[PDB]
Design a protein around this nucleic acid. Sequence first.
RNA 1: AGAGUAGAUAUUGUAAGCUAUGUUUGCCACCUUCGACUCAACAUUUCCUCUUGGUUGUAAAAGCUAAGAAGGGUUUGACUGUUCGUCAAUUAAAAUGUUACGUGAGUUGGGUUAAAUACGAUGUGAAUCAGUAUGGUUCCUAUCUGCUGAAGGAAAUAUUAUCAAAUUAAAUCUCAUUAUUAGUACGCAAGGACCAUAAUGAAUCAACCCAUGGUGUAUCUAUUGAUAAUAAUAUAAUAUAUUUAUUAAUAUAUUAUCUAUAUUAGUUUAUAUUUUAAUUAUUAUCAUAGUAGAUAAGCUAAGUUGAUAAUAAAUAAAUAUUGAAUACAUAUUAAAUAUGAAGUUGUUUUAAUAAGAUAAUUAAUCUGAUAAUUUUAUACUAAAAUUAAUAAUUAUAGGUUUUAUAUAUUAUUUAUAA
RNA 2: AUAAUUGAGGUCCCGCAUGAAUGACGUAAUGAUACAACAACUGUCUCCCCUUUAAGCUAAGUGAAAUUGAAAUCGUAGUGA
RNA 3: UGCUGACAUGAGUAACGAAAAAAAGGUAUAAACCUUUUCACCUAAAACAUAAGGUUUAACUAUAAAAGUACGGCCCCUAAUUAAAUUAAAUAUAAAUAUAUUUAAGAUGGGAUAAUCUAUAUUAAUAUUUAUCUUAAAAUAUAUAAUUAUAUUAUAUAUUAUAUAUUUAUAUAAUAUAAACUAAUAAAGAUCAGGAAAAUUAAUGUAUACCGUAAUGUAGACCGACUCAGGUAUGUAAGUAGAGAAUAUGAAGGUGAAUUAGAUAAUUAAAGGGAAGGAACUCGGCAAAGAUAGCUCAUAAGUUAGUCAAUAAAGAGUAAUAAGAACAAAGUUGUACAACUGUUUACU
RNA 4: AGGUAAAUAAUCUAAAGGGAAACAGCCCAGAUUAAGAUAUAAAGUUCCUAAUAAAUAAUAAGUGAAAUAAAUAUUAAAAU
RNA 5: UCAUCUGAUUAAUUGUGGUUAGUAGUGAAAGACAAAUCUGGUUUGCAGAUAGCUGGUUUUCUAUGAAAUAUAUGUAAGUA
RNA 6: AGUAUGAAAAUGAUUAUUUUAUAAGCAAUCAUGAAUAUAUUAUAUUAUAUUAAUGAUGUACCUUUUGUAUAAUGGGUCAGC
Lengths: 229, 112
Amino acid sequence: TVGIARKLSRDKAHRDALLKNLACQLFQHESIVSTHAKCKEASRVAERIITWTKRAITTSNSVAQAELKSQIQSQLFLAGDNRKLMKRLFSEIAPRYLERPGGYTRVLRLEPRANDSAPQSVLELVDSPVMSESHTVNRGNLKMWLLVKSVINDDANQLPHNPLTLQNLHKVAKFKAEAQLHGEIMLIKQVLLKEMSLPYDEALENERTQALLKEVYSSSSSYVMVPRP
Amino acid sequence: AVPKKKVSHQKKRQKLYGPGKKQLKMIHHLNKCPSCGHYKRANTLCMYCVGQISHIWKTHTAKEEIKPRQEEELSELDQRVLYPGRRDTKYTKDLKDKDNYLERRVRTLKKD
RNA sequence: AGAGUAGAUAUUGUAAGCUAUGUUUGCCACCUUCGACUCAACAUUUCCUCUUGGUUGUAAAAGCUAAGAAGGGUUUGACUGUUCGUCAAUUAAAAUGUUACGUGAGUUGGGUUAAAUACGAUGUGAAUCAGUAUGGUUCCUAUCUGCUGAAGGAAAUAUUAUCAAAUUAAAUCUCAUUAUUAGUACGCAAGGACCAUAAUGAAUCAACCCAUGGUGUAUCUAUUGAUAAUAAUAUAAUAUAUUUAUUAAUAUAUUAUCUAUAUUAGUUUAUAUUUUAAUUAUUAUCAUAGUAGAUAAGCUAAGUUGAUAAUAAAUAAAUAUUGAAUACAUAUUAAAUAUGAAGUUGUUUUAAUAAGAUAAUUAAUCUGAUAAUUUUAUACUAAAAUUAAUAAUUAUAGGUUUUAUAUAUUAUUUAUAA
RNA sequence: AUAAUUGAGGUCCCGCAUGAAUGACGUAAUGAUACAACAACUGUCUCCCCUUUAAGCUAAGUGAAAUUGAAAUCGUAGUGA
RNA sequence: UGCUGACAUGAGUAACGAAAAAAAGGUAUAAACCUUUUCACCUAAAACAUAAGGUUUAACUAUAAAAGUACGGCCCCUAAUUAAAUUAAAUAUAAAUAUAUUUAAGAUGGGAUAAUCUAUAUUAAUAUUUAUCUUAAAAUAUAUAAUUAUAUUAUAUAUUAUAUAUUUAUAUAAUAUAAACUAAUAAAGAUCAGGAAAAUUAAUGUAUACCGUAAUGUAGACCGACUCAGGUAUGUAAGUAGAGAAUAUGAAGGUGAAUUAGAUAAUUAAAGGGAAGGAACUCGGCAAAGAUAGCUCAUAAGUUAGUCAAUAAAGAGUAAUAAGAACAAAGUUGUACAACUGUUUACU
RNA sequence: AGGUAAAUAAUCUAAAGGGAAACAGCCCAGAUUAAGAUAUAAAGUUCCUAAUAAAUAAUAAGUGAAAUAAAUAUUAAAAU
RNA sequence: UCAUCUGAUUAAUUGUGGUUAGUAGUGAAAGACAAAUCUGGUUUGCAGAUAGCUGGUUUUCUAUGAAAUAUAUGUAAGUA
RNA sequence: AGUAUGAAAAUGAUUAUUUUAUAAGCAAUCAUGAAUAUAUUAUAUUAUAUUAAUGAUGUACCUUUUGUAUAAUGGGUCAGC
Ligand SMILES: [Mg+2]
Ligand SMILES: [Mg+2]
Ligand SMILES: [Mg+2]
Ligand SMILES: [Mg+2]
Ligand SMILES: [Mg+2]
Ligand SMILES: [Mg+2]
Ligand SMILES: [Mg+2]
Ligand SMILES: [Mg+2]
Ligand SMILES: [Mg+2]
Ligand SMILES: [Mg+2]
Ligand SMILES: [Mg+2]
Ligand SMILES: [Mg+2]
Ligand SMILES: [Mg+2]
Ligand SMILES: [Mg+2]
Ligand SMILES: [Mg+2]
Ligand SMILES: [Mg+2]
Ligand SMILES: [Mg+2]
Ligand SMILES: [Mg+2]
Ligand SMILES: [Mg+2]
Ligand SMILES: [Mg+2]
Ligand SMILES: [Mg+2]
Ligand SMILES: [Mg+2]
Ligand SMILES: [Mg+2]
Ligand SMILES: [Mg+2]
Ligand SMILES: [Mg+2]
Ligand SMILES: [Mg+2]
Ligand SMILES: [Mg+2]
Ligand SMILES: [Mg+2]
Ligand SMILES: [Mg+2]
Ligand SMILES: [Mg+2]
Ligand SMILES: [Mg+2]
Ligand SMILES: [Mg+2]
Ligand SMILES: [Mg+2]
Ligand SMILES: [Mg+2]
Ligand SMILES: [Mg+2]
Ligand SMILES: [Mg+2]
Ligand SMILES: [Mg+2]
Ligand SMILES: [Mg+2]
Ligand SMILES: [Mg+2]
Ligand SMILES: [Mg+2]
Ligand SMILES: [Mg+2]
Ligand SMILES: [Mg+2]
Ligand SMILES: [Mg+2]
Ligand SMILES: [Mg+2]
Ligand SMILES: [Mg+2]
Ligand SMILES: [Mg+2]
Ligand SMILES: [Mg+2]
Ligand SMILES: [Mg+2]
Ligand SMILES: [Mg+2]
Ligand SMILES: [Mg+2]
Ligand SMILES: [Mg+2]
Ligand SMILES: [Mg+2]
Ligand SMILES: [Mg+2]
Ligand SMILES: [Mg+2]
Ligand SMILES: [Mg+2]
Ligand SMILES: [Mg+2]
Ligand SMILES: [Mg+2]
Ligand SMILES: [Mg+2]
Ligand SMILES: [Mg+2]
Ligand SMILES: [Mg+2]
Ligand SMILES: [Mg+2]
Ligand SMILES: [Mg+2]
Ligand SMILES: [Mg+2]
Ligand SMILES: [Mg+2]
Ligand SMILES: [Mg+2]
Ligand SMILES: [Mg+2]
Ligand SMILES: [Mg+2]
Ligand SMILES: [Mg+2]
Ligand SMILES: [Mg+2]
Ligand SMILES: [Mg+2]
Ligand SMILES: [Mg+2]
Ligand SMILES: [Mg+2]
Ligand SMILES: [Mg+2]
Ligand SMILES: [Mg+2]
Ligand SMILES: [Mg+2]
Ligand SMILES: [Mg+2]
Ligand SMILES: [Mg+2]
Ligand SMILES: [Mg+2]
Ligand SMILES: [Mg+2]
Ligand SMILES: [Mg+2]
Ligand SMILES: [Mg+2]
Ligand SMILES: [Mg+2]
Ligand SMILES: [Mg+2]
Ligand SMILES: [Mg+2]
Ligand SMILES: [Zn+2]
């Protein structure tokens, strides 16, 4: 009751409802901006919900599965824009995370908001699809977009990629088919380059992407450690 | 409960500015953004790049505006007859001039 | 003087004598709130505990009186506004003061106190009272000092990281009962020890949460009323596909479960008619967390554990040795030589400080800070943990997995199958 | 009556200084009146503990007040309107 | 404790006024504005209609539309009351003025007609307060015309079928829920005994004036120096529940705010729980705790005879046995004073 | 009684300066403005703090050293 | 304000307007109310009321410089 | 509440000089080092100015009083009256 979670200056009933709302909004819009503390708590709920959904999907035990389903239902507000949220959770969202052991969200810190000095953050779903089956781009996966923008900038400058950038790319890849990842990167480039107004010679960009993928995939002192005399 | 004397210039100033707690600190923890080579806070996203990405998302993930057929296919004269102009209130006018009271985000300096 | 079986000075001490105190009642006029609660600090003129002198009135045991002694301790209830006092039950003892008769910018407001009112008395009366009774008004965010904690800056017998002694500031220091020595010493008997040790407690302090108890707006179950969802199923419509001969049948998606008319004015409900206008699973909200039964961590005392800090040194009152000055005597206010206290010095504990010590010394990873994730810590700070991802090793928080706990049904079961 | 009662009720009458429409006396009912007792209940207390929310604390924005001769505003004792 | 002005100090301290918010987008300008969705709060209101009031605050200047019928004023009429008014000499009076009488004013009240819509002008001629019972009537069932038990009992309209004037009129018959509520009717109980004032036929008329109308109105738009937890009149106030306008919920509607974000030490406030004890607290049980039906039964002493005491205490039935919404319901007694219900120091 | 009432003198009142630790009233002494060599007042002369050396006795109690505490007791010392 | 408590068909609560007040009304009577408070409102005027009382009264230099006693006083805070 | 002007002060921020982190009280005066600045006769071993090394002395002002550092009166500061 003290120390188990953030209180967030709200009465228990209100607080829980707020958290549910945040979770619903995260599932609907695959990224959302909010205050840092709220985002942190919301992540805990959303991740829990995702795991329960995964458990329901997997389990052979019928009773268990039913219980998981009931728990998931309890943890959401299913109305208006979130009428078919349960369906989405089972069919669209939870199947992304079957291999991933936890860590389905990422809270990314922003510069604190000016009017309030409140620490601001971006709660968002990990490995959200950047491109739907229709020829558009999807709202979400901000980190990936940022990475690709950084890559583009490095290419423009004719500089080597930073170790941190490479590490991030590797992390992104870990639960991604290589060809799919490449195609996503290419798609992101097309939009990003146009926005920034750099020229998109396609074959060269593809080659660069391929090169970036290759280095990611193929893995390759002051004090001396000496035994006791 | 109440101050016994007029607090002097010295004693108010040493109270306010003497302690380091009360002073402002240099923001040493700035560093370069990898997407655009500009200043940003450490362990923080660049507000320009994330803003740009948000804008891109908005432009792509855009719910189409509902233009009713009957109003779209009105004649100009007919439209004027139906929906004439009006004097807005002082309050309304003030609300309309958003650039007076609404702060757009500033761009940081380019890192060296 | 005089009591004290005898003897003024064991104990008592008329009236008169000489002082101290500023604790009472006064006097002076420089100067214009009693009690309770809470926390106490100081004194010693000591009530208890430790040491000791005297006590034909110290046999013993209880006492009485006096000297040293302030380390520790010194009460709970009935009555009353009361301090006090009376009593009850305890205690080793229930000491006396000082501190603006400590403490109302810390609490209270019963007493005292103004407005209302009544009573007794006084007065022709308005009204009055060293009277009685019921009722009844002040508030304050802390500038400075001070104190409790916590940081930053700093000058360091010159650096940093760590370990740190003397020292300083404080804390602590006990007491009871029982048992043994011993029914011994002592005493006719009745009664009944010192010296000393141990064990149980005590009051106080400190830490702790394994367990116990409490809590537990983590959680789970049960449960009354009202409302609102999702899913499934049925019906209907629209949109998209497939079959069929735009229609019908199928599949997917979305939306819908209304509506209108009758029953003599109005409202609601009911049924009938009208319409495609559905009843099961599972959720949620609200009603003090809706109420109730349990309840993890944490925190806590009703709980648990430990401590009351020795040995030692010099002393107080007091008790001696030898021994003159002074042929004796005299513990010395002589030279020498000894005993002696819950006190003193210390010891023990905490905080502060940092003499000293080990090491490294312009740095591909020197030491710190800013930043992030945090809790061992915490108002903010500070402190401590981690900031791994390369040749090795290092998990901070969440998430995940795990076993375990909680909840409450469960072998009338779960999983594999034949 | 209570372990124990300056309170309460009953009774006595040196009524300091009761008494008959400034009414006297005893009742039923009533009373947010005043005092006292019993029951039940309880954090009132023994003896406090845990929890909740709003403040307090920190950051951002706005922004009081009484007060103030001037202040570079320590302890003790003494002195002294 | 001079007056006026300016500027300090406390201090960037307290405070920012009962409050539930979240996301996405308008907008790579939003904690605060607008929209959408979610969540919550008010709901015999924080809703919807209005009265009064007011810097028009409004959905605004291209601005709140009336001949009259569940439309108000204006107008007619008057109450309370008011009037340099009214009557050789109304009466009185140092002046001012006052009195009586007339006339005039004066709403908070009364005021014809109306959907089968309605016609207001001119001229002429003679109602305090409360109640709807019992009986009786017929209707529906049980038993053998008459008894027993149960509802129903004055009015409010559509339908169908008849009989008369001639598909429009009049009357009759039959058909048809419950619970509230309205108006209009009738009969009538009580003492406290219940406003005032302004005709009818006939003929001729009637081209329908002025003002109010926004929004706000248990409130940021009025009265409180403030966008002030105060004060402020009336009517509707979805259903489910209930004796109910109590209480719970909330369909719809409205709202979520000139402060936010975090942290939640000490400490304060307002709540929830608490082992063993149970008033040991305290001036004092102050505060808190305490309800084993709320319906139907039953209910003592005393007593002024009044179920006054009584809503008696205890207790029963229905319900429930481990408990499991809110709200109503919080003991018994003795004494002093005052019969009682009332009134009082707006702010001790 | 730092009391009260008057008598006499002084000071303060209205008087600064030195001393009395600090000091309205006590001990000295009266600031016209400076200067700082010489006489000094009261009070002082180990240091704080301007200035000191002696003589003869007494005390041993830190008595006392600028605010004298009594009766009485004990121990000495002189003189008769 | 919150909780608690009391009345709640009556000597009830309340809207709209009216009457009665500054020697002065209303008052189930408290000296209670009469426009944020009355043993008698407010405003304007008499009016610069009066104050033996409190406080204040503004540059410099120079010379002299007290008193706090007696008597009287409805006088002992004054005045001769 | 005219119009111009405004190095009037209180008051705020900033810079420069100087002093200040082992020192205690009306914050001044006098003694006295040092540092800085200015100086068309500093010829210098110079002169002025500014500045809390260090030392000594120093109980705000007024009012009212027998008598006030008084913890008696009155004043937040400056400008005008
Ligand atoms: Mg709730
Ligand atoms: Mg939960
Ligand atoms: Mg004798
Ligand atoms: Mg005697
Ligand atoms: Mg003995
Ligand atoms: Mg003694
Ligand atoms: Mg000791
Ligand atoms: Mg008691
Ligand atoms: Mg006292
Ligand atoms: Mg005090
Ligand atoms: Mg005080
Ligand atoms: Mg009372
Ligand atoms: Mg010991
Ligand atoms: Mg425990
Ligand atoms: Mg445990
Ligand atoms: Mg347990
Ligand atoms: Mg526990
Ligand atoms: Mg009807
Ligand atoms: Mg249907
Ligand atoms: Mg609600
Ligand atoms: Mg113990
Ligand atoms: Mg001898
Ligand atoms: Mg001998
Ligand atoms: Mg000892
Ligand atoms: Mg790394
Ligand atoms: Mg860990
Ligand atoms: Mg590992
Ligand atoms: Mg982890
Ligand atoms: Mg008695
Ligand atoms: Mg009592
Ligand atoms: Mg009489
Ligand atoms: Mg009487
Ligand atoms: Mg009454
Ligand atoms: Mg702030
Ligand atoms: Mg003096
Ligand atoms: Mg002045
Ligand atoms: Mg402060
Ligand atoms: Mg503060
Ligand atoms: Mg604050
Ligand atoms: Mg936005
Ligand atoms: Mg209600
Ligand atoms: Mg409205
Ligand atoms: Mg008229
Ligand atoms: Mg009217
Ligand atoms: Mg209107
Ligand atoms: Mg309207
Ligand atoms: Mg107003
Ligand atoms: Mg006000
Ligand atoms: Mg208001
Ligand atoms: Mg309702
Ligand atoms: Mg609703
Ligand atoms: Mg509204
Ligand atoms: Mg607000
Ligand atoms: Mg308890
Ligand atoms: Mg219990
Ligand atoms: Mg007591
Ligand atoms: Mg009570
Ligand atoms: Mg009877
Ligand atoms: Mg009740
Ligand atoms: Mg009465
Ligand atoms: Mg009152
Ligand atoms: Mg005298
Ligand atoms: Mg004088
Ligand atoms: Mg003198
Ligand atoms: Mg003289
Ligand atoms: Mg002279
Ligand atoms: Mg001495
Ligand atoms: Mg002396
Ligand atoms: Mg009653
Ligand atoms: Mg009646
Ligand atoms: Mg009176
Ligand atoms: Mg007034
Ligand atoms: Mg009055
Ligand atoms: Mg005159
Ligand atoms: Mg005058
Ligand atoms: Mg002279
Ligand atoms: Mg004289
Ligand atoms: Mg005189
Ligand atoms: Mg006089
Ligand atoms: Mg120094
Ligand atoms: Mg100082
Ligand atoms: Mg002072
Ligand atoms: Mg003063
Ligand atoms: Mg003052
Ligand atoms: Zn950037």
